[PDB]
Tab-separated table of C-alpha atoms and ligand atoms in Angstrom:
chain	number	residue	atom	x	y	z
O	4	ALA	CA	-56.195	-25.467	120.493
O	5	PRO	CA	-53.184	-23.219	119.885
O	6	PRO	CA	-53.304	-19.602	120.866
O	7	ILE	CA	-52.947	-17.007	118.198
O	35	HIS	CA	-39.558	-4.675	122.191
O	36	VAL	CA	-41.942	-7.598	122.623
O	37	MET	CA	-39.565	-9.543	120.391
O	38	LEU	CA	-36.805	-9.249	123.010
O	39	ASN	CA	-35.414	-12.785	123.485
O	40	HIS	CA	-37.121	-14.256	120.398
O	41	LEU	CA	-35.220	-16.252	117.781
O	42	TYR	CA	-35.045	-14.658	114.340
O	43	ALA	CA	-33.717	-16.065	111.081
O	44	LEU	CA	-32.553	-15.204	107.597
O	45	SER	CA	-33.360	-17.864	105.011
O	46	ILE	CA	-30.561	-20.397	104.526
O	47	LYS	CA	-28.056	-19.829	101.713
O	48	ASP	CA	-24.912	-21.788	100.821
O	49	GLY	CA	-25.425	-24.274	103.646
O	50	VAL	CA	-24.983	-21.539	106.237
O	51	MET	CA	-27.684	-20.596	108.735
O	52	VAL	CA	-27.984	-17.114	110.216
O	53	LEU	CA	-29.687	-16.932	113.601
O	54	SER	CA	-30.350	-13.581	115.251
O	55	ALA	CA	-31.872	-12.377	118.507
O	56	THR	CA	-31.973	-9.173	120.529
O	57	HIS	CA	-31.054	-9.419	124.201
O	58	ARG	CA	-30.819	-6.703	126.836
O	59	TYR	CA	-27.811	-5.959	128.997
O	60	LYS	CA	-28.737	-3.368	131.545
O	61	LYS	CA	-29.841	-0.397	129.526
O	62	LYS	CA	-28.186	-1.591	126.336
O	63	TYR	CA	-29.633	-3.855	123.645
O	64	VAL	CA	-27.504	-6.255	121.615
O	65	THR	CA	-28.716	-7.867	118.400
O	66	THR	CA	-26.481	-10.875	117.761
O	67	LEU	CA	-26.144	-12.618	114.399
O	68	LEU	CA	-24.636	-16.106	114.384
O	69	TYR	CA	-23.328	-17.448	111.083
O	70	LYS	CA	-23.111	-21.208	111.588
O	71	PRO	CA	-22.517	-23.913	108.948
O	72	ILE	CA	-25.576	-26.114	108.640
W	23	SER	CA	-4.334	16.483	137.913
W	24	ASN	CA	-4.601	18.662	134.817
W	25	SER	CA	-1.592	17.073	133.121
W	26	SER	CA	-2.919	13.617	133.989
W	27	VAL	CA	-6.587	14.533	133.475
W	28	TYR	CA	-7.109	12.139	130.553
W	29	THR	CA	-5.707	9.165	132.476
W	30	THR	CA	-8.046	10.040	135.346
W	31	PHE	CA	-11.000	10.392	132.973
W	32	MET	CA	-10.337	6.965	131.456
W	33	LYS	CA	-9.975	5.289	134.850
W	34	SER	CA	-13.270	6.961	135.759
W	35	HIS	CA	-15.324	5.344	132.989
W	36	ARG	CA	-16.200	1.761	132.059
W	37	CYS	CA	-16.190	-0.054	128.717
W	38	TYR	CA	-19.950	-0.247	129.236
W	39	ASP	CA	-20.111	3.523	128.759
W	40	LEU	CA	-19.238	3.597	125.046
W	41	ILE	CA	-21.432	0.642	124.096
W	42	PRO	CA	-24.323	1.951	121.942
W	43	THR	CA	-27.914	1.891	123.224
W	44	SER	CA	-28.790	-0.454	120.369
W	45	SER	CA	-26.039	-2.367	118.580
W	46	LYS	CA	-25.586	-5.259	116.162
W	47	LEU	CA	-23.007	-8.009	116.689
W	48	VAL	CA	-21.958	-10.383	113.908
W	49	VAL	CA	-20.571	-13.708	115.121
W	50	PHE	CA	-18.981	-16.544	113.165
W	51	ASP	CA	-18.696	-20.203	114.036
W	52	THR	CA	-15.113	-21.333	113.455
W	53	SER	CA	-16.383	-24.172	111.260
W	54	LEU	CA	-17.400	-21.480	108.771
W	55	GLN	CA	-15.558	-21.404	105.445
W	56	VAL	CA	-13.137	-18.485	105.122
W	57	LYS	CA	-14.712	-17.425	101.807
W	58	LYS	CA	-18.240	-17.312	103.197
W	59	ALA	CA	-17.000	-15.557	106.321
W	60	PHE	CA	-15.288	-12.997	104.085
W	61	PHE	CA	-18.530	-12.377	102.200
W	62	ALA	CA	-20.460	-12.254	105.472
W	63	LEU	CA	-18.065	-9.524	106.604
W	64	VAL	CA	-18.695	-7.516	103.435
W	65	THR	CA	-22.495	-7.773	103.317
W	66	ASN	CA	-22.637	-6.665	106.960
W	67	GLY	CA	-20.092	-3.910	106.362
W	68	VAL	CA	-17.649	-4.892	109.101
W	69	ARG	CA	-13.895	-5.517	108.994
W	70	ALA	CA	-13.740	-8.055	111.836
W	71	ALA	CA	-15.876	-10.557	113.749
W	72	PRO	CA	-15.692	-12.475	117.060
W	73	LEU	CA	-15.046	-16.212	116.735
W	74	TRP	CA	-17.114	-18.855	118.519
W	75	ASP	CA	-15.807	-22.417	118.757
W	76	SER	CA	-18.610	-24.960	119.118
W	77	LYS	CA	-16.357	-27.769	120.356
W	78	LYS	CA	-14.952	-25.561	123.107
W	79	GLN	CA	-18.203	-23.686	123.689
W	80	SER	CA	-16.065	-20.555	123.894
W	81	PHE	CA	-15.027	-17.401	122.064
W	82	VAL	CA	-11.511	-18.093	120.796
W	83	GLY	CA	-10.517	-14.830	119.115
W	84	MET	CA	-11.090	-12.436	116.229
W	85	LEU	CA	-11.118	-12.749	112.447
W	86	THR	CA	-9.296	-9.736	111.027
W	87	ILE	CA	-7.712	-8.482	107.808
W	88	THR	CA	-4.330	-9.636	109.133
W	89	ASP	CA	-5.563	-13.226	109.347
W	90	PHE	CA	-6.446	-12.994	105.657
W	91	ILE	CA	-3.057	-11.416	104.940
W	92	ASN	CA	-1.282	-14.324	106.622
W	93	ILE	CA	-3.488	-16.821	104.781
W	94	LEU	CA	-2.887	-15.164	101.409
W	95	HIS	CA	0.803	-15.265	102.270
W	96	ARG	CA	0.696	-19.090	102.221
W	107	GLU	CA	-8.365	-23.739	98.938
W	108	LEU	CA	-7.508	-20.703	101.033
W	109	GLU	CA	-11.219	-20.034	100.918
W	110	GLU	CA	-12.501	-23.618	100.961
W	111	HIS	CA	-10.906	-24.440	104.309
W	112	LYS	CA	-12.524	-23.543	107.625
W	113	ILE	CA	-11.431	-20.696	109.892
W	114	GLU	CA	-10.596	-23.498	112.327
W	115	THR	CA	-8.197	-25.252	109.974
W	116	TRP	CA	-6.398	-21.980	109.280
W	117	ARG	CA	-6.186	-20.970	112.936
W	118	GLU	CA	-4.823	-24.441	113.711
W	119	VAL	CA	-2.122	-24.154	111.047
W	120	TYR	CA	-0.817	-21.259	113.134
W	121	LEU	CA	-1.964	-22.745	116.448
W	122	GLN	CA	-3.559	-19.345	116.998
W	123	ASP	CA	-5.763	-20.233	119.975
W	124	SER	CA	-2.740	-21.426	121.943
W	125	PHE	CA	-0.120	-18.859	120.965
W	126	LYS	CA	-2.226	-15.677	120.594
W	127	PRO	CA	-5.131	-16.577	122.868
W	128	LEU	CA	-8.328	-14.529	122.980
W	129	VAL	CA	-7.915	-11.164	124.708
W	130	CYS	CA	-11.221	-9.868	126.058
W	131	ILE	CA	-12.348	-7.218	128.519
W	132	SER	CA	-15.285	-6.838	130.916
W	133	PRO	CA	-18.009	-4.172	130.583
W	134	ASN	CA	-17.159	-3.044	134.118
W	135	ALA	CA	-13.432	-2.723	133.439
W	136	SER	CA	-12.180	0.828	132.893
W	137	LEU	CA	-11.395	2.451	129.544
W	138	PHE	CA	-7.846	2.927	130.820
W	139	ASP	CA	-7.583	-0.848	131.196
W	140	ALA	CA	-8.949	-1.239	127.667
W	141	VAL	CA	-6.364	1.110	126.163
W	142	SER	CA	-3.612	-0.582	128.168
W	143	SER	CA	-4.771	-4.036	127.065
W	144	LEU	CA	-4.977	-3.048	123.392
W	145	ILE	CA	-1.488	-1.546	123.541
W	146	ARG	CA	0.386	-4.254	125.456
W	147	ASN	CA	-1.188	-7.064	123.418
W	148	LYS	CA	-0.634	-5.283	120.096
W	149	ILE	CA	-4.223	-5.799	118.930
W	150	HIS	CA	-6.863	-3.417	117.566
W	151	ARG	CA	-9.995	-5.337	118.576
W	152	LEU	CA	-11.077	-5.931	122.174
W	153	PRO	CA	-14.313	-7.916	122.652
W	154	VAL	CA	-16.367	-6.707	125.615
W	155	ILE	CA	-17.599	-9.891	127.282
W	156	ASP	CA	-19.976	-10.207	130.237
W	157	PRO	CA	-18.462	-12.548	132.865
W	158	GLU	CA	-21.948	-13.376	134.123
W	159	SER	CA	-23.427	-14.726	130.897
W	160	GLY	CA	-20.277	-15.135	128.816
W	161	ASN	CA	-21.926	-13.058	126.103
W	162	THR	CA	-19.944	-10.753	123.837
W	163	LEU	CA	-21.634	-7.353	124.009
W	164	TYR	CA	-19.383	-5.128	121.916
W	165	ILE	CA	-16.032	-4.870	120.125
W	166	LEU	CA	-13.704	-2.121	121.356
W	167	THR	CA	-11.201	-0.317	119.127
W	168	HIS	CA	-8.684	2.514	119.500
W	169	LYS	CA	-10.843	4.618	117.196
W	170	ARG	CA	-13.981	4.319	119.322
W	171	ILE	CA	-12.059	4.988	122.531
W	172	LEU	CA	-10.361	8.005	120.945
W	173	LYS	CA	-13.645	9.539	119.785
W	174	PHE	CA	-14.951	9.125	123.325
W	175	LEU	CA	-11.823	10.774	124.720
W	176	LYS	CA	-12.121	13.452	122.035
W	177	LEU	CA	-15.656	14.389	123.078
W	178	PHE	CA	-14.089	15.010	126.482
W	179	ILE	CA	-10.938	16.660	125.144
W	180	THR	CA	-12.746	19.354	123.159
W	181	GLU	CA	-15.218	20.013	125.971
W	182	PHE	CA	-13.008	20.470	129.059
W	183	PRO	CA	-9.884	22.593	129.790
W	184	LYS	CA	-6.794	21.218	128.062
W	185	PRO	CA	-3.423	20.302	129.626
W	186	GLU	CA	-0.422	22.428	128.656
W	187	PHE	CA	1.130	19.503	126.777
W	188	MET	CA	-1.830	19.446	124.387
W	189	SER	CA	-0.411	22.736	123.112
W	190	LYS	CA	3.092	21.281	122.704
W	191	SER	CA	4.299	20.335	119.216
W	192	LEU	CA	5.050	16.814	117.973
W	193	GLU	CA	8.850	16.917	118.065
W	194	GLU	CA	8.448	18.664	121.408
W	195	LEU	CA	6.480	15.671	122.677
W	196	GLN	CA	8.237	12.930	120.819
W	197	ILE	CA	5.072	11.138	119.811
W	198	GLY	CA	5.118	8.756	116.877
W	199	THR	CA	7.518	6.363	115.297
W	200	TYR	CA	10.582	7.754	113.565
W	201	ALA	CA	12.853	4.740	113.026
W	202	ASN	CA	12.661	1.588	110.902
W	203	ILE	CA	9.676	2.985	109.007
W	204	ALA	CA	8.211	0.406	106.639
W	205	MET	CA	7.561	1.931	103.216
W	206	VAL	CA	7.186	0.904	99.579
W	207	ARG	CA	8.223	2.371	96.290
W	208	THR	CA	5.752	2.956	93.496
W	209	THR	CA	7.721	0.365	91.529
W	210	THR	CA	7.403	-2.212	94.311
W	211	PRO	CA	5.336	-5.311	93.420
W	212	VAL	CA	2.269	-6.045	95.559
W	213	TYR	CA	3.557	-9.437	96.718
W	214	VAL	CA	6.689	-7.743	98.041
W	215	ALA	CA	4.491	-5.377	100.048
W	216	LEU	CA	2.563	-8.441	101.206
W	217	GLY	CA	5.760	-9.908	102.626
W	218	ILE	CA	6.738	-6.721	104.446
W	219	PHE	CA	3.279	-6.444	106.023
W	220	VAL	CA	3.726	-9.885	107.576
W	221	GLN	CA	7.338	-9.042	108.418
W	222	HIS	CA	6.761	-5.723	110.189
W	223	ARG	CA	3.274	-6.224	111.639
W	224	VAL	CA	2.143	-2.812	110.423
W	225	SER	CA	-1.237	-1.660	109.086
W	226	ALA	CA	-0.287	0.606	106.206
W	227	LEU	CA	2.777	1.404	104.100
W	228	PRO	CA	3.728	4.859	102.806
W	229	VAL	CA	4.321	4.805	99.046
W	230	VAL	CA	7.400	6.760	97.980
W	231	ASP	CA	8.965	7.923	94.719
W	232	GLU	CA	12.563	7.826	93.686
W	233	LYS	CA	13.129	10.952	95.802
W	234	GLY	CA	11.556	9.305	98.838
W	235	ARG	CA	8.681	11.768	98.936
W	236	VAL	CA	5.355	10.293	100.014
W	237	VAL	CA	2.846	9.999	97.175
W	238	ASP	CA	0.339	7.475	98.505
W	239	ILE	CA	-0.447	5.041	101.319
W	240	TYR	CA	-0.832	1.285	100.845
W	241	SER	CA	-2.793	-0.852	103.303
W	242	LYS	CA	-3.517	-4.509	104.046
W	243	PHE	CA	-7.027	-3.911	102.719
W	244	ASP	CA	-5.621	-2.839	99.349
W	245	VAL	CA	-3.824	-6.183	99.131
W	246	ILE	CA	-6.995	-8.067	100.053
W	247	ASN	CA	-9.074	-6.037	97.598
W	248	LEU	CA	-6.627	-6.826	94.796
W	249	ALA	CA	-6.675	-10.534	95.652
W	250	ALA	CA	-10.478	-10.759	95.829
W	251	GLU	CA	-10.370	-9.409	92.282
W	252	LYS	CA	-8.782	-12.737	91.301
W	253	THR	CA	-7.054	-11.232	88.243
W	256	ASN	CA	-1.711	-11.245	90.034
W	257	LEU	CA	0.360	-9.743	92.866
W	258	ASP	CA	3.232	-9.310	90.398
W	259	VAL	CA	1.874	-5.872	89.477
W	260	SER	CA	3.489	-2.804	91.060
W	261	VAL	CA	1.950	-0.723	93.850
W	262	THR	CA	0.704	2.259	91.834
W	263	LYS	CA	-1.067	0.122	89.233
W	264	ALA	CA	-2.930	-1.748	91.970
W	265	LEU	CA	-3.803	1.630	93.480
W	266	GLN	CA	-5.422	2.589	90.175
W	267	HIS	CA	-8.000	-0.104	90.948
W	268	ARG	CA	-9.185	1.761	94.056
W	269	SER	CA	-12.638	3.169	94.819
W	275	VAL	CA	-2.755	11.498	101.503
W	276	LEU	CA	-2.779	12.721	105.041
W	277	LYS	CA	0.330	13.975	106.646
W	278	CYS	CA	1.448	16.118	109.478
W	279	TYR	CA	4.342	18.376	110.474
W	280	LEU	CA	6.505	18.134	113.593
W	281	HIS	CA	5.861	21.795	114.430
W	282	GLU	CA	2.091	21.273	114.608
W	283	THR	CA	0.411	20.913	118.009
W	284	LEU	CA	-0.610	17.555	119.495
W	285	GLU	CA	-4.178	18.914	119.785
W	286	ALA	CA	-4.206	19.890	116.114
W	287	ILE	CA	-2.801	16.472	115.123
W	288	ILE	CA	-5.602	14.753	117.086
W	289	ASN	CA	-8.430	16.820	115.589
W	290	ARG	CA	-7.041	15.964	112.146
W	291	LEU	CA	-7.046	12.243	112.930
W	292	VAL	CA	-10.566	12.179	114.350
W	293	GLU	CA	-12.040	14.540	111.749
W	294	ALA	CA	-11.157	12.355	108.766
W	295	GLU	CA	-11.761	9.184	110.784
W	296	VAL	CA	-8.372	8.036	109.509
W	297	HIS	CA	-5.995	5.766	111.417
W	298	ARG	CA	-2.619	7.526	111.099
W	299	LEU	CA	-0.622	10.397	109.618
W	300	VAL	CA	2.599	10.320	107.713
W	301	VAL	CA	5.049	12.734	109.276
W	302	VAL	CA	6.952	14.519	106.532
W	303	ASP	CA	9.515	17.157	105.530
W	304	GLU	CA	8.677	20.328	103.640
W	305	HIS	CA	9.490	18.398	100.478
W	306	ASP	CA	7.238	15.626	101.753
W	307	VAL	CA	10.074	13.243	102.426
W	308	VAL	CA	8.853	10.902	105.127
W	309	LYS	CA	10.132	11.600	108.622
W	310	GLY	CA	7.716	9.652	110.812
W	311	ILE	CA	4.304	8.138	111.494
W	312	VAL	CA	1.725	8.938	114.171
W	313	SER	CA	-1.123	6.505	114.625
W	314	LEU	CA	-4.082	6.318	116.914
W	315	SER	CA	-2.270	4.037	119.233
W	316	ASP	CA	0.581	6.496	119.495
W	317	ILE	CA	-1.994	9.099	120.505
W	318	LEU	CA	-3.823	6.942	123.055
W	319	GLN	CA	-0.631	5.785	124.765
W	320	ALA	CA	0.562	9.398	124.908
W	321	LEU	CA	-2.655	10.817	126.347
W	322	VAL	CA	-3.917	7.925	128.437
W	323	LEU	CA	-1.250	5.331	129.200
W	324	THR	CA	1.074	8.246	129.832
M	8	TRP	CA	-36.037	-11.503	109.227
M	9	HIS	CA	-38.324	-14.365	110.250
M	10	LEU	CA	-39.770	-15.086	113.688
M	11	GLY	CA	-39.256	-18.759	114.515
M	12	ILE	CA	-40.338	-21.373	111.981
M	13	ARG	CA	-43.682	-22.045	110.298
M	14	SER	CA	-45.622	-25.266	109.736
M	15	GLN	CA	-48.980	-26.235	108.239
M	16	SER	CA	-49.272	-29.642	109.898
M	17	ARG	CA	-51.844	-30.304	112.622
M	18	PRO	CA	-50.879	-28.644	115.948
M	19	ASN	CA	-50.827	-31.948	117.850
M	20	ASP	CA	-48.550	-33.489	115.217
M	21	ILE	CA	-46.238	-30.472	115.301
M	22	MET	CA	-45.916	-30.862	119.076
M	23	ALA	CA	-45.438	-34.598	118.743
M	24	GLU	CA	-42.537	-33.795	116.395
M	25	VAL	CA	-40.919	-31.287	118.722
M	26	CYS	CA	-40.879	-33.725	121.665
M	27	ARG	CA	-39.403	-36.378	119.378
M	28	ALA	CA	-36.765	-33.917	118.185
M	29	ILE	CA	-36.005	-32.996	121.795
M	30	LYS	CA	-35.606	-36.653	122.772
M	31	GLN	CA	-33.307	-37.307	119.817
M	32	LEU	CA	-31.521	-34.226	121.143
M	33	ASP	CA	-31.506	-35.722	124.643
M	34	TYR	CA	-32.653	-32.341	125.964
M	35	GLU	CA	-34.900	-32.590	129.020
M	36	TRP	CA	-38.300	-30.926	128.624
M	37	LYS	CA	-41.501	-30.113	130.515
M	38	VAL	CA	-45.033	-29.138	129.520
M	39	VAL	CA	-46.598	-25.926	130.794
M	40	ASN	CA	-49.349	-25.951	128.237
M	41	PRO	CA	-50.384	-28.419	125.606
M	42	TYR	CA	-48.523	-26.348	123.039
M	43	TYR	CA	-45.986	-24.428	125.028
M	44	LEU	CA	-42.826	-25.827	126.534
M	45	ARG	CA	-39.658	-25.287	128.543
M	46	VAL	CA	-36.489	-26.972	127.301
M	47	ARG	CA	-33.360	-27.422	129.405
M	48	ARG	CA	-30.109	-28.385	127.730
M	49	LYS	CA	-27.388	-29.130	130.222
M	50	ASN	CA	-23.991	-28.250	128.817
M	51	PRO	CA	-21.536	-31.053	127.956
M	52	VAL	CA	-18.364	-28.922	127.851
M	53	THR	CA	-19.087	-26.083	130.270
M	54	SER	CA	-21.188	-28.354	132.486
M	55	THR	CA	-23.711	-25.528	132.787
M	56	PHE	CA	-27.376	-25.071	131.910
M	57	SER	CA	-29.095	-23.363	129.026
M	58	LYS	CA	-32.867	-23.021	129.119
M	59	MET	CA	-35.316	-21.824	126.486
M	60	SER	CA	-39.067	-21.863	125.889
M	61	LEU	CA	-41.220	-22.927	122.936
M	62	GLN	CA	-44.721	-21.643	122.351
M	63	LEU	CA	-46.883	-22.696	119.444
M	64	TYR	CA	-48.953	-19.930	117.920
M	65	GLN	CA	-51.437	-20.102	115.077
M	66	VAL	CA	-51.076	-17.522	112.295
M	67	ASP	CA	-53.981	-18.243	109.975
M	68	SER	CA	-56.563	-20.945	109.283
M	69	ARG	CA	-53.978	-23.310	107.789
M	70	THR	CA	-50.682	-22.104	109.280
M	71	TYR	CA	-48.939	-22.244	112.668
M	72	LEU	CA	-45.868	-20.438	114.040
M	73	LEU	CA	-43.347	-22.059	116.387
M	74	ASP	CA	-41.713	-19.454	118.628
M	75	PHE	CA	-38.311	-19.834	120.295
M	76	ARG	CA	-37.653	-17.764	123.421
M	77	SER	CA	-34.500	-17.881	125.549
M	78	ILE	CA	-34.658	-17.901	129.351
M	79	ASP	CA	-32.613	-15.590	131.577
M	87	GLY	CA	-19.418	-20.159	127.006
M	88	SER	CA	-22.096	-17.738	125.825
M	89	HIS	CA	-25.792	-18.014	126.727
M	90	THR	CA	-26.929	-16.178	123.597
M	91	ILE	CA	-24.858	-18.418	121.336
M	92	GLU	CA	-25.864	-21.598	123.166
M	93	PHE	CA	-29.480	-20.510	122.727
M	94	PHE	CA	-28.852	-20.250	118.987
M	95	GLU	CA	-27.235	-23.695	119.007
M	96	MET	CA	-30.152	-25.270	120.881
M	97	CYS	CA	-32.562	-23.726	118.377
M	98	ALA	CA	-30.429	-24.721	115.384
M	99	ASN	CA	-30.347	-28.385	116.407
M	100	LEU	CA	-34.113	-28.487	116.960
M	101	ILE	CA	-34.800	-26.910	113.569
M	102	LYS	CA	-32.370	-29.258	111.812
M	103	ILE	CA	-34.285	-32.292	113.068
M	104	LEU	CA	-37.581	-30.582	112.243
M	105	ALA	CA	-36.112	-29.665	108.856
M	106	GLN	CA	-35.960	-33.353	107.950
J	1	ATP	N1	-8.931	-9.563	121.037
J	1	ATP	C1	-8.097	-10.358	120.370
J	1	ATP	N2	-7.676	-11.472	120.912
J	1	ATP	C2	-6.846	-12.301	120.323
J	1	ATP	N3	-6.362	-12.091	119.126
J	1	ATP	C3	-6.697	-10.998	118.450
J	1	ATP	C4	-7.601	-10.050	119.034
J	1	ATP	N4	-7.747	-9.081	118.149
J	1	ATP	C5	-7.017	-9.388	117.098
J	1	ATP	N5	-6.392	-10.523	117.278
J	1	ATP	C6	-5.490	-11.154	116.320
J	1	ATP	O1	-4.425	-10.269	116.132
J	1	ATP	C7	-4.091	-10.135	114.781
J	1	ATP	C8	-4.031	-8.659	114.428
J	1	ATP	O2	-5.325	-8.130	114.251
J	1	ATP	P1	-5.729	-6.681	114.652
J	1	ATP	O3	-7.139	-6.592	114.896
J	1	ATP	O4	-4.868	-6.212	115.710
J	1	ATP	O5	-5.324	-5.843	113.382
J	1	ATP	P2	-5.953	-5.765	111.936
J	1	ATP	O6	-5.835	-7.091	111.370
J	1	ATP	O7	-5.345	-4.612	111.278
J	1	ATP	O8	-7.460	-5.532	112.261
J	1	ATP	P3	-8.136	-4.143	112.100
J	1	ATP	O9	-8.783	-4.181	110.794
J	1	ATP	O10	-9.117	-4.103	113.192
J	1	ATP	O11	-7.004	-3.232	112.221
J	1	ATP	C9	-5.116	-10.905	114.012
J	1	ATP	O12	-4.576	-12.113	113.538
J	1	ATP	C10	-6.169	-11.252	115.009
J	1	ATP	O13	-6.584	-12.573	114.805
J	2	ATP	N1	4.632	2.049	108.196
J	2	ATP	C1	5.024	2.003	109.466
J	2	ATP	N2	6.292	1.745	109.743
J	2	ATP	C2	6.725	1.692	110.986
J	2	ATP	N3	5.950	1.892	112.034
J	2	ATP	C3	4.653	2.160	111.908
J	2	ATP	C4	4.103	2.232	110.579
J	2	ATP	N4	2.826	2.509	110.731
J	2	ATP	C5	2.588	2.602	112.038
J	2	ATP	N5	3.678	2.391	112.750
J	2	ATP	C6	3.807	2.401	114.212
J	2	ATP	O1	3.392	1.140	114.661
J	2	ATP	C7	2.591	1.236	115.804
J	2	ATP	C8	1.215	0.710	115.457
J	2	ATP	O2	0.973	0.992	114.102
J	2	ATP	P1	-0.434	0.763	113.466
J	2	ATP	O3	-0.673	1.829	112.501
J	2	ATP	O4	-0.527	-0.657	113.068
J	2	ATP	O5	-1.209	0.933	114.793
J	2	ATP	P2	-2.305	2.008	114.916
J	2	ATP	O6	-2.602	2.462	113.563
J	2	ATP	O7	-2.000	2.895	116.041
J	2	ATP	O8	-3.543	1.198	115.307
J	2	ATP	P3	-4.741	1.869	114.557
J	2	ATP	O9	-4.632	1.487	113.110
J	2	ATP	O10	-5.983	1.387	115.225
J	2	ATP	O11	-4.267	3.205	114.955
J	2	ATP	C9	2.482	2.687	116.125
J	2	ATP	O12	3.419	3.076	117.096
J	2	ATP	C10	2.878	3.365	114.872
J	2	ATP	O13	3.526	4.527	115.316
């Protein structure tokens, strides 16, 4: 059944603490790469 | 355009130019609790963060030390960034100021100066993404790399008095005896980053900043204490009018500090030159 | 940091859950592969579109990895929000 800088565009996560969730991902703008971390209340 | 070289240089380059090849951007949702946001700032080692409002699906502004200062000046930590921004109707009155990657550095400096802010989010109009956060310091370093490396204008040689750069009236200062809460009030009252600490003579002995106040408060032990005692909890740079603008700049950038106290031979405070004073002098002028 | 989320349920069940979660979400979805997907969330406020992709990988004999990939307000942040909602429902 299921199949077993590549990461570019893939969701990443720190484990949840204090009811806050940290989502991160690396996206490319032109020749620059931005890793964004979003702290959002669960 | 030798005497306008820097202006030309800044109009020549984009905000995209001083964005790092690889960079990390910490973003808060406005529903976040102030306390948790504060701790998120510390663990990441940043002094400010862009704000994203889920209801509006938009970036609504920045969370800075000043916002904490205002808050402290009025459960502070239990409430959401939203709630606090609403108390001041911040989104409406001081709306987000952002700049495009393709906008010029000159525009960035101008925007920072005219809006009296230190953070300028670089947002891509195409995706709406925030790519980077601009500051006077980062722009100045960039300019500095250019300054040191290409022929200088004659005014770079001119002294401070000679050029009239800095602020020499209505200087906000504190006395060693001054309580911290008093200093708190004057911060909010004068919209200034740091306060020279002076003795009975008026000579400068130390510098007190908004961060000192916030550090003391996070300690949760009373604001009534004087300024020197609070300074003992920690862990000065000055200039002379006769010194050259170029020498002043190097000094600023070398110690990655934000301003100098201008002082007399006896160290009595005469003035203050900050990064913004420098940028406006070189670039905006 | 962790890539996507993990699960030790049977692949078909995992995918049955995702579709359910997506429907609860009201996000439209399509099926490229039995365990791969493309999810389109239209935007309520900005009346725009945000699209992402889900691919189910196996990791070992007993474990599977659900991967979230965005497709080229803020698009990065909206991508996070779309993922967050999905995971919250799957968290239950
Ligand atoms: N780009 C911006 N758009 C809208 N408001 C802003 C922006 N940057 C800062 N502010 C607001 O302006 C106020 C002053 O913050 P500013 O960043 O200028 O100084 P600060 O608090 O000393 O921060 P820093 O530590 O960067 O100096 C803060 O309340 C902040 O919310
Ligand atoms: N204690 C002070 N009293 C009066 N004016 C000040 C004081 N400190 C700075 N200024 C003046 O206020 C303006 C901005 O001051 P501030 O130090 O907040 O900005 P800045 O430091 O240039 O920004 P940055 O911290 O990024 O340089 C500048 O013209 C500066 O000359």
